[PDB]
Amino acid sequence: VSPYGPEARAELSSRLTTLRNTLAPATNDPRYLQACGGEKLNRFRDIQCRRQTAVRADLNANYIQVGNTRTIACQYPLQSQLESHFRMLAENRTPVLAVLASSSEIANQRFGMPDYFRQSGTYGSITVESKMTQQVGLGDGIMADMYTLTIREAGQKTISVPVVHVGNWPDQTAVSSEVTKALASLVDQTAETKRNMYESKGSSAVADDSKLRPVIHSRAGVGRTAQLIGAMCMNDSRNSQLSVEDMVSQMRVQRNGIMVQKDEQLDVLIKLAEGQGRPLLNS
Numbered sequence: 409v410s411p412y413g414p415e416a417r418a419e420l421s422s423r424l425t426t427l428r429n430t431l432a433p434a435t436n437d438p439r440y441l442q443a444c445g446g447e448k449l450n451r452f453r454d455i456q457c458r459r460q461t462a463v464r465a466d467l468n469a470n471y472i473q474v475g476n477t478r479t480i481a482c483q484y485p486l487q488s489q490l491e492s493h494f495r496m497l498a499e500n501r502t503p504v505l506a507v508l509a510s511s512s513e514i515a516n517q518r519f520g521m522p523d524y525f526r527q528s529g530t531y532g533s534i535t536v537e538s539k540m541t542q543q544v545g546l547g548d549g550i551m552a553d554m555y556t557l558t559i560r561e562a563g564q565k566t567i568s569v570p571v572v573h574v575g576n577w578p579d580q581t582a583v584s585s586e587v588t589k590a591l592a593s594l595v596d597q598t599a600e601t602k603r604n605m606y607e608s609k610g611s612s613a614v615a616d617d618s619k620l621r622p623v624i625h626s627r628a629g630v631g632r633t634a635q636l637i638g639a640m641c642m643n644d645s646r647n648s649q650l651s652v653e654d655m656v657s658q659m660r661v662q663r664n665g666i667m668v669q670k671d672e673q674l675d676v677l678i679k680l681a682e683g684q685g686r687p688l689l690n691s
């Protein structure tokens with residue numbers, strides 16, 4: 409009986425479907441961060457932000473810990489949220505910002521996805537400089553474009569953030585397991601280089617577990633984002649024996665029930681787990 413056979417797969421899907429359904433947000437749900445005074449918080453009305461793990465009161469963004477792996481998952485910031493988003497990125501000493509929304513999505517003005525990392529700009533008191541750096545192919549034609557974002561604000565320490573932009577991963581799809589591995593390695597390596605610099609400089613952030621977290625977002629911050637975070641957690645040696653059930657349940661209780669949004673995205677996590685001999689189900 410394979411632990412990765414149709415019966416185990418069906419059981420995993422049944423457990424996760426129950427969890428998605430019971431985590432769906434109620435109106436004024438105490439579990440979810442609420443908008444204040446009419447200003448839009450959630451890019452998508454029913455893709456909400458777990459209050460207990462919210463990063464900032466005015467962002468749809470969550471602290472995520474899968475096993476031992478600590479990240480932030482968020483939605484693509486709204487235009488009104490850009491100053492706060494850049495403050496999140498700077499205060500976190502962000503070692504990598506992985507953006508998985510496509511160039512086509514960002515270009516479509518109907519979607520309200522500001523092009524905040526590929527060009528320079530001013531957002532309230534913050535000035536952001538963008539520089540293009542290397543381009544890395546990930547397989548199957550999927551491409552990572554990298555940037556450095558330098559975040560300035562009078563009186564504040566200047567912070568530069570490495571960005572990994574996958575510009576051609578379409579919404580509601582899963583890139584293959586091989587592409588996912590290549591992406592997770594690139595994001596982890598980018599993060600480790602930048603974290604190492606901070607540690608070399610004696611940054612206080614090194615000792616603060618709310619900081620130095622990779623920040624990942626897509627458009628909603630639940631589909632492409634969750635596939636990448638699940639693959640990153642499987643690269644962390646500390647996460648031996650953490651099951652797929654655990655990793656998806658943790659992302660869901662810590663952000664919302666949509667984390668791992670499409671069956672094809674769950675299937676990639678299952679395939680990566682099987683490759684490691686990692687359990688799918690608890691017990």
Ligand SMILES: [Cl-]
Pocket residue numbers: 438439440458459460461
């Ligand atoms: Cl909560």
